Write an enzyme that holds these catalytic residues in place. Structure first.
Site, PDB file in Angstrom:
ATOM      1  N   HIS A  78      97.393 -39.110  31.013  1.00  0.00           N
ATOM      2  CA  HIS A  78      97.921 -37.744  31.144  1.00  0.00           C
ATOM      3  C   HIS A  78      99.362 -37.757  30.633  1.00  0.00           C
ATOM      4  O   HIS A  78      99.720 -36.886  29.847  1.00  0.00           O
ATOM      5  CB  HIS A  78      97.732 -37.204  32.558  1.00  0.00           C
ATOM      6  CG  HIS A  78      96.314 -37.110  33.008  1.00  0.00           C
ATOM      7  ND1 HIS A  78      95.992 -36.918  34.331  1.00  0.00           N
ATOM      8  CD2 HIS A  78      95.141 -37.177  32.337  1.00  0.00           C
ATOM      9  CE1 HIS A  78      94.682 -36.913  34.465  1.00  0.00           C
ATOM     10  NE2 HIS A  78      94.139 -37.058  33.269  1.00  0.00           N
ATOM     11  N   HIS A 237      90.149 -30.459  29.663  1.00  0.00           N
ATOM     12  CA  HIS A 237      90.619 -31.746  30.225  1.00  0.00           C
ATOM     13  C   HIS A 237      90.134 -32.959  29.412  1.00  0.00           C
ATOM     14  O   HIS A 237      90.912 -33.896  29.290  1.00  0.00           O
ATOM     15  CB  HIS A 237      90.214 -31.891  31.689  1.00  0.00           C
ATOM     16  CG  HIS A 237      90.910 -33.041  32.287  1.00  0.00           C
ATOM     17  ND1 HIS A 237      92.119 -32.880  32.908  1.00  0.00           N
ATOM     18  CD2 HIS A 237      90.638 -34.358  32.292  1.00  0.00           C
ATOM     19  CE1 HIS A 237      92.563 -34.074  33.288  1.00  0.00           C
ATOM     20  NE2 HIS A 237      91.678 -34.985  32.935  1.00  0.00           N
ATOM     21  N   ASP A 241      92.602 -35.753  27.825  1.00  0.00           N
ATOM     22  CA  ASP A 241      92.361 -37.211  27.960  1.00  0.00           C
ATOM     23  C   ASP A 241      92.334 -37.847  26.577  1.00  0.00           C
ATOM     24  O   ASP A 241      92.963 -38.885  26.392  1.00  0.00           O
ATOM     25  CB  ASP A 241      91.062 -37.483  28.712  1.00  0.00           C
ATOM     26  CG  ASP A 241      91.127 -37.264  30.217  1.00  0.00           C
ATOM     27  OD1 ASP A 241      92.285 -37.215  30.778  1.00  0.00           O
ATOM     28  OD2 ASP A 241      90.033 -37.151  30.831  1.00  0.00           O
ATOM     29  N   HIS A 264      86.932 -42.214  28.225  1.00  0.00           N
ATOM     30  CA  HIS A 264      87.970 -43.236  27.962  1.00  0.00           C
ATOM     31  C   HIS A 264      87.341 -44.475  27.299  1.00  0.00           C
ATOM     32  O   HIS A 264      87.966 -45.069  26.389  1.00  0.00           O
ATOM     33  CB  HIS A 264      88.676 -43.547  29.278  1.00  0.00           C
ATOM     34  CG  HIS A 264      89.343 -42.364  29.884  1.00  0.00           C
ATOM     35  ND1 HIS A 264      90.430 -41.725  29.278  1.00  0.00           N
ATOM     36  CD2 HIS A 264      89.112 -41.718  31.051  1.00  0.00           C
ATOM     37  CE1 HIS A 264      90.841 -40.752  30.066  1.00  0.00           C
ATOM     38  NE2 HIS A 264      90.045 -40.726  31.167  1.00  0.00           N
TER      39      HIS A 264
HETATM   40  C1  FXU Z   1      85.901 -37.044  34.545  1.00  0.00           C
HETATM   41  S1  FXU Z   1      86.642 -37.382  33.103  1.00  0.00           S
HETATM   42  O1  FXU Z   1      85.774 -38.121  32.239  1.00  0.00           O
HETATM   43  O2  FXU Z   1      87.003 -36.152  32.520  1.00  0.00           O
HETATM   44  C2  FXU Z   1      87.971 -38.350  33.355  1.00  0.00           C
HETATM   45  C3  FXU Z   1      89.030 -37.694  34.223  1.00  0.00           C
HETATM   46  C4  FXU Z   1      90.265 -38.584  34.452  1.00  0.00           C
HETATM   47  N1  FXU Z   1      91.139 -38.599  33.244  1.00  0.00           N
HETATM   48  C5  FXU Z   1      90.990 -37.864  35.542  1.00  0.00           C
HETATM   49  O3  FXU Z   1      91.873 -37.077  35.186  1.00  0.00           O
HETATM   50  N2  FXU Z   1      90.553 -38.061  36.803  1.00  0.00           N
HETATM   51  C6  FXU Z   1      91.092 -37.524  37.947  1.00  0.00           C
HETATM   52  C7  FXU Z   1      92.219 -36.655  38.031  1.00  0.00           C
HETATM   53  C8  FXU Z   1      92.627 -36.201  39.292  1.00  0.00           C
HETATM   54  C9  FXU Z   1      91.936 -36.593  40.462  1.00  0.00           C
HETATM   55  C10 FXU Z   1      90.848 -37.436  40.340  1.00  0.00           C
HETATM   56  O4  FXU Z   1      90.147 -37.916  41.401  1.00  0.00           O
HETATM   57  C11 FXU Z   1      89.336 -37.103  42.246  1.00  0.00           C
HETATM   58  F1  FXU Z   1      90.058 -36.143  42.792  1.00  0.00           F
HETATM   59  F2  FXU Z   1      88.377 -36.494  41.584  1.00  0.00           F
HETATM   60  F3  FXU Z   1      88.815 -37.935  43.138  1.00  0.00           F
HETATM   61  C12 FXU Z   1      90.453 -37.898  39.115  1.00  0.00           C
HETATM   62 ZN    ZN Z   2      92.157 -36.973  32.828  1.00  0.00          ZN
END
Ligand code: FXU
Ligand code: ZN
Ligand code: CL
Ligand code: MG
Length: 299
Positions: A78, A237, A241, A264
Site C-alpha cells: 500500500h 483495491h 495492490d 501478490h
Molecule cells: C484480498 S486481496 O487479494 O485483494 C489482497 C488484499 C491485501 N493487499 C490487503 O490489503 N489486505 C488487508 C487489508 C486490510 C485488512 C485486512 O485484513 C482483514 F481485515 F481482512 F482481516 C487485509
Molecule cells: Zn491491499
C-alpha cells in the site's frame, strides 16, 4: 530532463500492525539518487536494510512481504503503491517492527504523508522501464501479462463465487497518472470476509484487522454499504495492490498490465519473469519532459 524524486522532509506516522495489533513507528526519510525505496528495521541491532526489489519478495499469502535471511517486512504493497503514485524514486522507510502500519487499509494515509513531506527533485535523470515484448504467466486459469503500451495502463478482472459479487465479475482499468491514482484507486479498501477474519483471530492473527481497515462482508453482502468509497471497490483495491507490487521493479513502468484473478503471488511471478527476460524491456530517460508518457504530481 525528467528528474528523480525523493521526500523534501523527514515525516513520521504511528499505526497498528495488521497481524500484531500493536503500534508500529514509521519514518519516511529522504534518500540519495539511485537508492530506490529501502525498508529499514530500526528495532534491530545492527539495523537491517531490505531494498524494495522483486528478488527480495518472500513467499506469503494475501500480502507482499520483503525478506533478508530471517528478517521480514510485511504489507509493503500500500505504501509502495503511494510511492509509485506520487513518483517517489528514492526514500528510506524505517519501521519499529516487521509490518508496515495498516492505517485505513488503503494508500490514502500514505499519499497524505508523502504529499505533506513534499516532493524534492534531485540532480539525476529519472529511469523508466519500457516493456518491449509481451510477457505473460499463467497459474491455473489465473493470468498476468505485460504488453508494450505508450503510458502506464493497469487492468484487472476478478471472478469469485461469494454472493457479495452478485454472480458477476468485477473489471476496472486505470490509465495511470498521479491524479487518476489519487482519485480512482488510492482510497480503495479490500473485502474482509467475517468467516476468514474470525478464523485468523482464533490463531491470534489479524489482531489489527477491523471495519477501520477493510469493508467487512458476511455470508452474502457488505454489512455497511456506508463504508464503501467506490463502485467495484474490490477490483480497484486489486489495482492499488498491483501498482505497489509492480513498483518492486525499482522504477516507473511504461506499458500495460492486465491481471485475470491475479494477486501478490502471480504479480511477483510476472515481475520476476519480465526481469529475467532481458530483451522484453529497456531502461529509458527523457531529456525533454514534454515527450514523456506519464503525468506525475508537480513538486
Ligand atoms: C484480498 S486481496 O487479494 O485483494 C489482497 C488484499 C491485501 N493487499 C490487503 O490489503 N489486505 C488487508 C487489508 C486490510 C485488512 C485486512 O485484513 C482483514 F481485515 F481482512 F482481516 C487485509
Ligand atoms: Zn491491499
Ligand atoms: Cl489476457
Ligand atoms: Mg526474450
Amino acid at each position: 530532463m525528467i528528474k528523480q524524486r525523493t521526500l523534501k522532509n523527514i515525516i513520521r506516522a504511528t499505526g497498528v500492525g495488521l497481524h500484531s495489533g500493536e503500534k508500529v513507528y514509521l519514518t519516511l526519510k529522504p534518500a540519495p539518487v539511485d537508492t530506490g525505496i529501502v525498508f529499514s528495521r530500526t528495532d534491530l541491532d545492527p539495523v537491517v536494510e531490505i531494498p524494495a526489489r522483486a528478488e527480495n519478495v518472500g513467499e506469503t499469502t494475501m500480502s507482499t512481504t520483503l525478506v533478508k535471511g530471517d528478517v521480514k517486512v510485511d504489507t509493503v504493497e500500500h505504501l509502495l503503491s503511494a510511492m509509485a503514485g506520487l513518483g517517489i524514486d528514492n526514500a528510506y522507510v524505517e519501521l519499529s517492527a516487521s509490518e508496515v502500519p495498516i492505517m485505513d487499509g488503503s494508500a490514502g494515509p500514505f499519499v497524505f504523508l508523502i504529499q505533506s513531506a513534499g516532493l524534492q527533485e534531485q540532480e539525476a535523470a529519472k529511469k523508466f522501464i519500457r516493456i518491449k515484448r509481451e510477457v505473460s504467466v499463467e497459474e491455473g486459469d489465473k493470468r498476468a501479462v505485460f504488453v508494450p503500451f505508450d503510458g502506464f495502463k493497469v487492468s484487472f478482472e476478478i471472478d469469485f463465487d461469494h454472493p457479495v459479487f452478485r454472480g458477476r465479475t468485477q473489471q476496472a482499468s486505470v490509465d495511470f497518472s498521479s491524479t487518476s491514482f489519487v482519485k480512482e484507486v488510492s482510497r480503495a479498501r479490500t473485502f474482509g470476509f467475517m468467516r476468514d477474519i474470525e478464523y485468523l483471530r482464533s490463531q491470534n492473527l489479524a489482531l489489527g484487522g477491523s471495519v477501520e481497515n477493510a469493508i467487512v462482508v458476511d455470508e452474502n453482502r457488505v454489512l455497511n454499504e456506508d463504508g464503501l468509497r467506490y463502485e467495484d471497490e474490490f477490483v480497484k483495491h486489486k489495482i492499488l495492490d498491483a501498482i505497489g507490487d509492480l513498483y518492486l521493479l525499482g522504477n516507473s513502468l511504461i506499458g500495460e498490465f492486465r491481471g485475470f484473478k491475479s494477486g501478490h503471488a502471480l504479480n511477483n511471478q510476472l515481475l520476476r519473469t519480465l526481469i529475467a527476460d532481458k530483451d522484453a524491456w529497456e531502461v529509458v530517460t527523457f531529456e525533454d519532459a514534454r515527450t514523456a508518457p506519464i503525468s506525475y504530481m508537480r513538486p
